[PDB]
Amino acid sequence: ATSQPINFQVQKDGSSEKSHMDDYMQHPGKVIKQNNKYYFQTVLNNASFWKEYKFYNANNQELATTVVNDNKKADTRTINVAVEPGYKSLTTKVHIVVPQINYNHRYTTHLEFEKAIPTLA
Ligand code: HEM
Numbered sequence: 001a002t003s004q005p006i007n008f009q010v011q012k013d014g015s016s017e018k019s020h021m022d023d024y025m026q027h028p029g030k031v032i033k034q035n036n037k038y039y040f041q042t043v044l045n046n047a048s049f050w051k052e053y054k055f056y057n058a059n060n061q062e063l064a065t066t067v068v069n070d071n072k073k074a075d076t077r078t079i080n081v082a083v084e085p086g087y088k089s090l091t092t093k094v095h096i097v098v099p100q101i102n103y104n105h106r107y108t109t110h111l112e113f114e115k116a117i118p119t120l121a
Contacts, residue, residue: 001032001033001034002032002033002034002120002121003030003031003032003033003041003120004030004031004118004120005028005029005030005031006028006029006030006031006040006113006114006115006117006118007027007028007029007113007114007115008025008027008028008029008040008042008111008112008113008114009022009111009112009114010022010025010092010109010110010111010112011109011110011111011112012109013107013108013109013110019109021092021094021107021109023045024044024045024046024049024050025042025043025044025045026042026043026045026076029041029042029043030042031083031117031118031120032080033120033121037082038082038083038084038085038117038120039080039081039082039083040080040081040083040087040090040113040117041068041078041079041080041081042078042079042081043076043077043078043079044076044077044078044079045075045076046075046076047070047071047075047076047077048075049096049097049098050077050094050095050096051095051096051097052093052094052095053065053079053092053093053094053095054092054093054094055081055090055091055092055111056090056091056092056093057083057087057090057091058087058088058089058091060091063081063082063083063090064081064082065079065080065081065082066079066080067079068080083117084117085116085117085118085119085120086116086117087113087116087117088112088113088116088117089110089111089112089113090110090111091108091109091110091111092108092109092110092111093106093107093108094106094107094108094109095107
């Protein structure tokens with residue numbers, strides 16, 4: 001397995017404006033290559049707020065996500081999202097629950113890699 005950091009920004013549905021969702025993922029993320037497979041590895045902040053998250057490519061095919069680590073004390077979670085070299089944009093669909101502000105909403109956003117996912121090595 002080899003990796004490189006990658007810059008990205010989550011943007012609002014139907015807009016190029018930065019999404020609130022961008023604030024809850026750590027920057028930069030990471031691209032990982034292992035055994036002919038690529039992953040975008042990213043850390044969700046305040047993971048307990050994220051009741052559901054699903055990721056899709058530009059062809060609206062759901063991308064497999066796995067938990068790398070779930071850190072309850074820090075309230076973070078590292079996940080891998082299956083990707084391929086050349087991916088530029090992911091659609092995400094999330095259900096966010098913040099009980100202390102009576103907040104319970106579902107959203108779609110698009111995550112924009114700064115550059116296409118590169119071919120590593
Ligand atoms: C306690 C923390 C939070 C506050 C105060 C908050 C506040 C808001 C507000 C006020 C809006 C409506 C649009 C606006 O007025 O700007 C909004 C929408 C939205 N929020 Fe939350 N939010 C919180 C947590 C989160 C989390 C944890 C996520 C996802 C990880 C999230 C994702 C979104 C998304 C995707 C929208 C739709 C517009 C956009 O894409 O930015 N929010 N939020």
